[PDB]
């Protein structure tokens, strides 16, 4: 139902802040019972979960990135975004936008976006 | 009670001529609760029409019902030889059911 | 003899009665909380055909209630209006102060008849019927409720309608109501979302009764 | 597609009783999700007379009777055996008639979704009729 | 000391509770609107532990209710506060 | 944080034959586990959720089971396009950890 | 200002309010107990003719109740159904939650009529009417009760029927009912056992009304 | 979060929740007191025309009450009996336990009709309606009440009748009833004493209706 589309700069330099925005369409942000999340690909490796923002604007971050990550949201436009500070080459990855649900029926069903590749280099 | 009376007792018409048979109810009734049936010896009556004006399926377009209040009619636009049957009225009354006495149609 | 949970910066512990924990400080009564949780969070089936088999009737036992301060949103709430075959009521009217559960996603409203052996309908597993901020041992007529349990601790809708026949017995049958004259046979394999999808295609396409008769649908087995 | 066939008739003496039956097929079961069923009789030389009808269980399972048979005839059903019964007590010779079972049924529209039937407040399906003779 | 032995567990909670002229009943919200809301996750096993706790406290609560005569009991937690104090300063 | 362990790292199977993969939790995950199919260039495709329910659009040849700490994914007969990296994910804790990915080979 | 008894390994003492006893430890609320005792244990007469003279009617005073946690078995409980001469009721229906006293040996059910001056029947000595686990200042219609008193402290049936006339006044009369048409004049010298013995010999021997009239028996004075 | 006053040998202080005062000794629960005070003590107008503009109707909000242990004598209490134009009632019957305010000097009884938009009449400033020893958020039918507020702290009639039309709206009218057929137009400049003086001169002098018509008086503007 809800389509998720990531967008951002594509290429960033070391020590810059990376900003990725996910457009929410076919639904809305204040949907009651949903988490808006981000996942990092680490090409050649498995996935690392980054964090979530609630429908109420509350956040939680994966402790490994807690000091480097800000997740925020704007319900007037139906967008949410990931702000990753102090990037390095190690952060090259496809970043994904996803939605999760607290409802029992939909508890295991994710909605994934297309995924956007971010390269970090000099 | 709500009772159905048919008139005329016998209809007489050559095949190809138009025929009508009316029923008068002792009580007023809405259209959706009326029906007519067609009977030949050896057969249970066929539905023909129900809801005053809605045709039963398997029934030719020449058969058409109409009416309101206490007065209802079945019109056969052209009566065919195969249609010279005994016709009956029926009403549902939202609960008790009533049948007419049976009217014969002859050539 | 009702246990209390204690929330620490470690995990959730159960308070003893024989062991006094000197560090389990309670600074005010506002740190005590009554929480109503739903049974659906434990994986119990929620379809109407299976749900009603957990309920039954009895006499000789009075109803009682307790309060909540907080609780869960329910995906599936129920609302019953059941009559005896002679037209009389099976369930008591809710008393003053009882209101429906405030946060339900789908409400399954079941109207119908059946034998009602007792005075009140009770939960067979001992779970409570959850009303606004009150858990009850019984079902009240016409009031929306969730099934659940209550914890005590120290802290630091879309409305789907069904018809029913034989409601209070073991062998019963249900229909999903699309319109006054349009019904679909109900099965335990149907989810609330499924029923809503069927309601949209049937209603939108006009595959509903036009005559005064009831049109009863049967889902393709596949 | 629905058919119902009458039996249990023949000769009975006045002052006695008998029970007629009508067993069918082609429907979706005659107890639930189904039309109620009526009995109608027609003495030779006479038009049809309503006796009464048993409602389906989803509609309450009650019987609506015609005035001429009140307190003498009972309309009932053998649930899930698709069989309609008529218990006629206090028989009089005036009760000689052909006794028919009748059903407000037939198939409705289908969809890619599933199959459907209609249950009516009038009759589409008539049985053959079982003759009941009451005589001395 | 809580072992969750349920077939399955919803790891998260979606909860509700009740916490100028708004305070005046005449101008304030209707009952359907007096509730707040939010989500909690299973931080350190707390939610599944809590579901198991509610499943275990049920037997004690039903026996308690059988014994009492109040039609509605609002006092379970006040009794707990009193016993807490008596056990420490009796 | 729950470490998920998968086995074997690589699972060669002849086309037409089935195959199974294992995933082990460090602490119980009740049923709250999902399987995804990963191919080069695409977002992972959800196959199974709640340790056994098929996602919409997933063929009947895929099936799973398990509870607690022991989970499995079975393909009854591998077809073309069933050769992919298969990942398990637990959604019972909030670090939302993942396994390593097993490489199913021809 | 309600006294508490304190149970020691010595005797029962009455707790003061001015004197604090440092050794009178209270470890939990489960050591506090409400106990309902019957008046019959003090030798009060229990026959119907004398019992009803301790009760009377008044208006302008509302009824109130308190709970028990425990209490005595009663040898003699009462159940009243009294109407005014015009056919209206004298006693109010019992409210929800009021149930009869659970442990009675003989129940004296009195049905009849008489003047009922007030709104409620109250106990004249200030004793309470004891219902299941609730003491009340008033009599409820149709509910079995014992007469008694309530103590607070720190811890460490055969159904006999009577007819009555003039129930609420000083000069009243009673009959013991054997059958619909068979009665025995009642006296204050009769015990419950006596009445049961008379019911067996009269009923067993057939010395009961056969005609449509009422047969009224009078006990030999000796 | 309800404040408590603390009475000292200095003045009245408001107890904090963050600051613990070690000398604020509480020796028993009998030192805690709930006090109901009247709004008239703050100078609010008490004439009927102005009083009713502080009240109004609403739906969707349930009524609730709290108790008093003590309170003020009221100079002006009110008692309403208001019906809808179709003859049905606007106000609910008072439930068991609600009794009128015990100490009123003048009772202003208003009978009449008007639109009644909601389920209950609520106070617009959030004040409570004071019944015997219970404050309530709503007005009960036929019961005498005072308007007021409730404090919590640590301690150490003549009946004047009016008719009303359009009772629940902004533009309403009132009459002072002298007799069944005799009325005086009411104004906001009249005090209870004034009305009593008019009732004595009119009634005593016989300036009342004799015919079957209603005699309506209008006070000289000066
Ligand atoms: C706290 O948590 C525990 C653990 O989850 C819960 O335990 C459940 O307890 C109920 C019983 O109260 C179990 O339910 C079923 O009980 C049936 C036995 O009773 C039947 O027969 C008697 C007469 O002899 C009738 O009176 C009664 O109404 C029943 O008809 C079993 O036969 C059932 O097993 C069968 O059906 C199930 C259907 O799901 C199948 O899965 C089984 O394989 C089998 O065919 C069943 O056991 C329930 O199963 C227990 N749960 C678990 C996980 O074992 C507590 O109830 C819970 N407390 C609260 C308040 O929520
Ligand atoms: C199966 O699918 C059908 C088809 O969608 C659903 O039918 C709809 O049900 C909803 C909910 O009851 C209806 O929505 C509301 O209907 C009210 C009544 O309107 C009647 O009169 C107007 C003409 O004046 C007709 O056009 C209309 O069809 C009705 O006959 C409206 O008053 C409501 O609007 C007001 O209130 C809402 C809040 O509730 C506000 O948001 C609005 O701004 C406004 O103030 C509203 O429209 C809807 O109309 C039904 N549609 C049809 C085609 O029938 C079934 O409910 C569904 N069943 C299940 C189980 O899912
Ligand atoms: C706690 O324990 C004490 C001690 O046992 C009990 O004390 C009893 O108190 C009652 C009164 O409340 C005594 O009963 C009788 O009171 C009569 C006076 O009242 C009559 O007249 C007034 C009008 O003036 C009426 O309103 C009223 O209804 C009565 O009609 C006396 O006249 C009685 O004495 C006569 O009758 C008795 C019958 O048994 C004879 O034995 C006497 O000799 C005499 O002829 C009588 O006194 C009662 O007697 C007191 N008991 C004892 C042992 O003295 C408390 O009542 C008890 N509290 C509770 C709650 O149980
Ligand atoms: C004065 O003395 C007489 C004579 O003994 C007493 O009369 C007896 O009263 C008891 C209690 O009411 C009766 O016992 C119960 O009667 C029920 C009704 O049975 C009627 O129908 C049967 C025929 O089917 C007749 O034989 C019978 O006489 C009645 O007309 C029965 O259904 C009861 O049995 C069931 O319930 C009991 C529990 O209550 C179980 O233990 C049984 O196993 C069974 O399930 C029971 O028999 C008794 O029948 C009366 N006997 C006679 C001869 O009339 C008066 O009560 C007594 N009065 C006083 C003040 O002491
Ligand atoms: C605790 O103590 C304080 C201080 O005394 C009290 O404060 C009073 O608060 C009320 C409001 O709740 C003030 O009353 C009047 O409010 C009017 C505004 O509301 C109108 O319009 C809205 C729609 O916009 C309607 O919903 C509403 O019903 C009203 O129609 C003002 O317009 C009023 O001012 C005018 O009239 C007065 C009449 O006396 C004139 O004196 C003014 O000059 C002006 O023309 C008015 O303000 C009230 O005035 C406040 N008191 C004081 C002294 O300022 C608390 O209410 C009290 N709490 C409790 C529980 O008792
Ligand atoms: C406007 O002014 C008039 C004139 O004063 C007031 O009318 C008086 O109202 C009072 C209060 O209601 C009346 O006082 C009581 O009347 C009872 C009824 O008596 C009727 O029958 C007798 C004949 O038997 C007639 O004389 C009488 O006029 C009535 O028609 C009496 O039973 C009362 O007496 C008993 O009770 C009181 C306690 O209430 C005891 O103190 C007595 O001792 C006795 O036991 C009492 O007399 C008074 O009678 C009315 N007078 C007249 C002339 O009508 C209006 O009330 C006033 N209106 C306002 C708003 O102020
Ligand atoms: C519902 O309960 C009834 C009993 O009250 C069951 O009826 C019995 O079923 C057994 C077969 O298991 C037969 O041998 C008995 O003769 C039946 N007794 C009666 C009185 O009919 C019934 O089968 C149960 N139905 C369901 C769906 O469980
Ligand atoms: C019941 O009370 C009435 C009074 O209400 C008693 O009647 C009076 O009795 C005295 C004798 O003691 C007579 O002198 C009076 O004339 C009687 N008054 C009336 C109005 O009749 C009656 O005696 C009392 N009865 C009993 C048994 O105590
Ligand atoms: C009572 O309220 C009504 C509105 O419900 C007021 O009516 C309006 O008054 C204004 C003038 O201030 C007019 O311009 C509007 O056309 C009126 N509307 C309607 C529907 O009549 C009314 O004036 C108020 N009365 C009092 C005494 O305050
Ligand atoms: C169903 O009944 C309601 C009245 O309760 C009526 O408004 C509606 O049109 C009816 N629908 C059909 C199909 O008869
Ligand atoms: C109802 O719809 C069916 C299917 O299209 C059609 O055959 C039937 O004649 C319709 N009935 C009426 C009364 O229009
Ligand atoms: C007394 O009345 C009951 C009905 O309440 C009846 O069953 C019984 O036979 C009657 N006894 C006599 C002696 O009439
Ligand atoms: C009733 O019993 C008495 C005493 O045995 C007898 O004289 C009388 O005739 C009997 N009455 C009837 C109607 O049998
Ligand atoms: C007013 O009505 C009462 C009855 O309620 C009657 O007693 C009284 O005489 C009447 N007064 C007038 C002036 O009609
Ligand atoms: C009522 O009083 C007025 C003024 O004194 C007088 O004119 C009128 O005639 C009187 N009416 C009756 C019926 O006496």
XYZ file of N, CA, C and O in Angstrom, chain E residues 21 23-32 34, chain H residues 56-58 60-62 122-126 137:
96
model
N -9.480 26.886 29.261
C -10.802 26.451 29.728
C -10.923 24.957 29.557
O -11.937 24.358 29.876
N -9.820 22.479 31.145
C -10.066 21.691 32.337
C -11.525 21.673 32.775
O -11.909 20.855 33.604
N -12.331 22.586 32.271
C -13.719 22.677 32.660
C -14.506 21.639 31.876
O -14.535 21.749 30.656
N -15.242 20.696 32.502
C -16.008 19.635 31.845
C -16.917 20.140 30.733
O -17.066 19.506 29.694
N -17.450 21.336 30.917
C -18.313 21.973 29.944
C -17.598 22.277 28.627
O -18.215 22.240 27.566
N -16.329 22.685 28.690
C -15.599 23.063 27.491
C -14.581 22.031 27.054
O -14.066 22.102 25.936
N -14.276 21.087 27.917
C -13.251 20.113 27.633
C -13.748 19.077 26.638
O -14.856 19.192 26.126
N -12.929 18.081 26.310
C -13.182 17.032 25.351
C -14.194 16.016 25.813
O -14.363 15.801 27.008
N -14.824 15.363 24.848
C -15.737 14.259 25.096
C -14.910 13.072 25.503
O -13.732 13.015 25.155
N -15.523 12.092 26.152
C -14.798 10.939 26.680
C -13.925 10.210 25.669
O -12.848 9.726 26.008
N -14.305 10.134 24.424
C -13.469 9.403 23.487
C -12.096 10.059 23.265
O -11.148 9.412 22.791
N -10.243 11.743 25.749
C -9.469 12.080 26.953
C -8.248 11.205 27.129
O -7.604 11.239 28.171
N -24.928 25.499 31.717
C -25.323 25.178 30.346
C -25.348 23.696 30.103
O -24.997 22.920 30.979
N -25.758 23.283 28.918
C -25.863 21.857 28.674
C -24.850 21.308 27.709
O -24.478 21.948 26.729
N -24.452 20.076 27.982
C -23.521 19.337 27.147
C -23.743 17.830 27.174
O -24.329 17.274 28.112
N -21.763 13.855 26.022
C -20.481 13.177 25.764
C -19.549 13.145 26.974
O -18.495 12.494 26.956
N -19.952 13.840 28.024
C -19.211 13.928 29.263
C -20.060 13.381 30.403
O -21.187 13.836 30.558
N -19.626 12.348 31.134
C -20.342 11.771 32.249
C -20.227 12.673 33.473
O -19.247 13.406 33.574
N -24.054 21.396 33.173
C -22.731 21.565 33.768
C -22.442 23.006 34.123
O -23.005 23.938 33.547
N -21.577 23.218 35.103
C -21.194 24.579 35.448
C -20.145 25.091 34.462
O -19.106 24.458 34.273
N -20.338 26.281 33.918
C -19.415 26.817 32.924
C -18.083 27.293 33.445
O -17.163 27.479 32.661
N -17.952 27.561 34.735
C -16.684 28.052 35.237
C -15.931 26.906 35.863
O -14.859 27.078 36.432
N -16.530 25.727 35.818
C -15.939 24.576 36.439
C -16.247 24.471 37.920
O -15.638 23.652 38.606
N -20.453 17.518 39.443
C -20.261 18.275 38.239
C -21.577 18.629 37.540
O -21.575 19.484 36.655
